[PDB]
Amino acid sequence: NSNICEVCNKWGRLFCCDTCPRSFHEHCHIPSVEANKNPWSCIFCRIKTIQERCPESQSGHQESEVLMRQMLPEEQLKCEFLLLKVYCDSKSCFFASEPYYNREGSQGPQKPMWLNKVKTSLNEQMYTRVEGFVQDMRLIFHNHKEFYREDKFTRLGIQVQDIFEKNFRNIFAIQETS
């Protein structure tokens, strides 16, 4: 197994996958690494199994149909993995914890949002459809773009949103378009 966490790229107290060489901090994995379970298979492995059980699940889908899906176990897992892919980027640090807003010439968002809030929301099964999860994720970056206006820091929102959107299209097998 790897000797650094797959998500944050640091060493520490690492839990190792039994079916692939990845390793994780306990609360870096999503869901948090399960207490017992020998063997244990990481989220990457669990997602690959879904694909292998239903190869047709990789055919192209329309975003509008994906968003309306109910959060059954497989869609719950897919959203957890998509959230984890965002945390994998080091620029996620900016969006993880609860923001505050005091900048001359800007007003804070009406509905603040952050990664750890989305994480808790998934853990507590608060989303009933994929749309709920995707809306909150996109809100994180939209709030940032609006608040930072012409400051070059707005680019961090564009960057992390791009990571989100690329991984959304991959994980949910969105139909490729020009």
Which residue is listed with tokens 């378009």? 177
Q: x/- string (CB under 5 A) for Zn ion, residues 97-126?
A: ------------------------------
CB distance 158 to 72 below 8 Å:
no
Tokens of 164: 């989100």
- Phi first, then psi: give them for residue 23, nearest 5 degrees: -130, 160
Q: Is 86 in the site for Zn ion (CB under 5 A)?
A: no
Cβ distance to Zn ion smaller for residue 38 or 102 = 38
DSSP one-letter code for 147: H
Q: How far is the CB of 12 from Zn ion (least distance, A)?
A: 7
Q: x/- string (CB under 5 A) for Zn ion, residues 129-148?
A: --------------------
- CB within 8 Å of 58: residues ≥ 6 apart: 51, 173
Question: Which amino acid appears at position 128 of this protein?
Answer: T
Cβ distance to Zn ion smaller for residue 35 or 104 = 35
Q: How far is the CB of 57 from Zn ion (least distance, A)?
A: 8
Which string of DSSP letters, residue by residue, matches 65-103? HHHT-B--HHHHHHHHHHHHHHHTSGGGHHHHSPP----
Query: Which residues, 17 to 56, sit near Zn ion by CB under 5 A?
Result: 17, 20, 25, 28, 42, 44-45, 54
Q: Is 7 in the site for Zn ion (CB under 5 A)?
A: yes
* Interacting residues with Zn ion (CB under 5 A): 5, 7-8, 17, 20, 25, 28, 42, 44-45, 54
